Design a protein around this ligand. Structure first.
Ligand SMILES: [Ca+2]
Ligand SMILES: [Ca+2]
Lengths: 131, 131, 131, 131, 131, 131
RNA sequence: UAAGGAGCACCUA
RNA sequence: UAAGGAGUACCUA
RNA sequence: UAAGGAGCACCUA
RNA sequence: UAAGGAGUACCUA
């Protein structure tokens, strides 16, 4: 897994391609950025993999996408983050797990995010409780 | 009411369907497990949603998928858990975010987990660092 | 009383239908929301019913309707609650009360809210004291 | 001046009119009761309006409706209170709200209390929880 | 097991349907009540399930049905509970049990209550001991 | 209530008849057992009725059904109990109750166990809590 | 808060 | 744990 | 503040 | 009295 581009699609009317491009690796944590050239508007996606002491294999994804409005006056722009959204995924695997297993695992949780998975969607997207 | 079934497809040759049926809700943390008639080694999936004081809505998805095989002790065949895979997801949205934003947001990370997304896959599945 | 939609009409020139739709039940307190997709603009209506220890039957309604202006800049909207209005109703009934009784009770207080009930209206709506 | 009569209709077969006549004002809390010549088991309705320091106007309506029946003790027939029903209403408005807002606001909650509003009625009248 | 309505038939000449509507859930203990119109004498049916630490699932049902009669004191008619009947069914399954096993279990115990099983009926209904 | 045979049907595809023959009566506690041919794993159903001093008739039924499997140790086949399921129904009537009242009571509770009463079934058989 | 660590949404700084 | 106890998932051994 | 609890707008944390 | 606890009408608070 060499640091490279990563292109995520959103759920827009006609899917848009957000293209994060390598920014760097700092302490075994890769960062990829979808940017304009201005650090705060940057939506960043990071990823890491560590083997704990007890021998479990953990890895973490983090995606941060800020919403920023740029006020413009006589030519000078003044960006300001008006709100942000963050999400973190953490896989905890067993040193005896097989690739197939792991894969299916991801597959499942990945699938659980789909828009039609009512139970989930209404919460992660519509912010409704469970009851 | 809210808590209902949930079916996740895995990434097998011909994607299987794991049907999680509701189990309970404790502390506004809904659980829905998918299992055989026995309450052992059942793959659980939970979902919660709290609104912090700061005024941020943040929900949590947690999926546990234990691998079970049958062991034989004096002819006493019993299914048992050999190992477990865990994954947690945490969304933290701003109370001023719009449904679209959130949706696209989910959609993206949703996309990030994925057979083809080299960067990510090779790590959360092949357990290979980033370089 | 299963959590369902609830449609309240306002006193607009030609009555408008605000349609609150189920959000969830948290600790025996149902919430229904008239929403846009953005949590703060949400006008919420909650309702509960508890039997006290001494054997009285209490129930509580709460309605919160925020006024929010959305500033828009080059496409990015920035909602902000500029003021809110809250109201709470609490019924305290006796374990020996009959339905008819209770009903009429509600009927009365309900009627007391009408626009033509001068004594009340001038206060709850025009913020005038009594004298 | 301000405190005057107030007539509330109940939900009987042919809606009756309960005419509350003024009684007194103590602490800027106006009371208007509806009763027969005797000061016992009279249904009282009160209304107040204070302006908190925060700069919020909030008024309070309180209605008490006791059920009275005549008991006979040694031929000494006397009406007595067997049980009482209470209901309190609390409006909290923003000192920058407009007459319309407030009116619509009241109108809505006014609407919420109502024979047909299933959700609410079944609870504040049938005393049934929400699910 | 969504807290919902529970309808129970009795052994009357031509079976009556007592409909217990939900009331609430306190500590993972649902409570459905069947009211007359007057909260007093309302029959309550509660239910709960806890999972011990020894891998045992215990479930508890309680049903309570009071008998009410209007007592008259000096022309004051008042409905009151003269006596109540209680019952507590209580299961204790082993975390290793089949879903089928459990069903049959209940099935049997349930059958035992049947009106014709002379052995139990004469005791739980005719108050005879065994001999 | 002569200690006699008690035949219990189960929920099997095509209902089986488990016949509990008497065993004995110890302290006004009858015990009927259904054996396989081998005393071990025999399911026991006990029943008793005591009259408290406060004029309350209490009755208690207990049913126990073990699951047996032949374990093999060095060519030694031995039938053994791997797990058991227990249940304790328990009535508490008032010495002033009608014979009819009691019947209806049982009737209902008995009905509640029915396989279709989703509320209870999912709990006592599918181990789901309430929510 | 944690690229902290566990597992019948828990415990450690 | 109670074929303990009750104007009740609540106390007593 | 309280889905706290009462009753000739009161009292409890 | 216990939505206490169990290779069980039997112990624990
Ligand atoms: Ca005999
Ligand atoms: Ca529910």
């Amino acid at each position: 897994a060499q640091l490279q581009n990563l292109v995520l699609k959103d759920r827009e009317a006609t899917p848009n391609d957000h293209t994060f491009v390598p920014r760097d690796i700092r302490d075994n944590v890769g960062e990829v950025v979808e940017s304009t050239g201005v650090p705060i508007g940057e939506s960043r996606f990071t990823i890491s993999l560590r083997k704990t002491s007890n021998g479990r294999y953990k890895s973490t994804l983090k995606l941060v996408v800020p919403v920023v409005q740029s006020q413009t006056v006589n030519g000078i722009v003044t960006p300001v983050v008006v709100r942000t959204s963050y999400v973190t995924v953490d896989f905890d695997y067993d040193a005896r797990s097989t690739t197939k297993e792991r894969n299916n695992f991801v597959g499942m949780i990945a699938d659980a995010l789909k828009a039609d998975k009512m139970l989930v969607h209404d919460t992660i997207v519509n912010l409704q409780g469970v009851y």
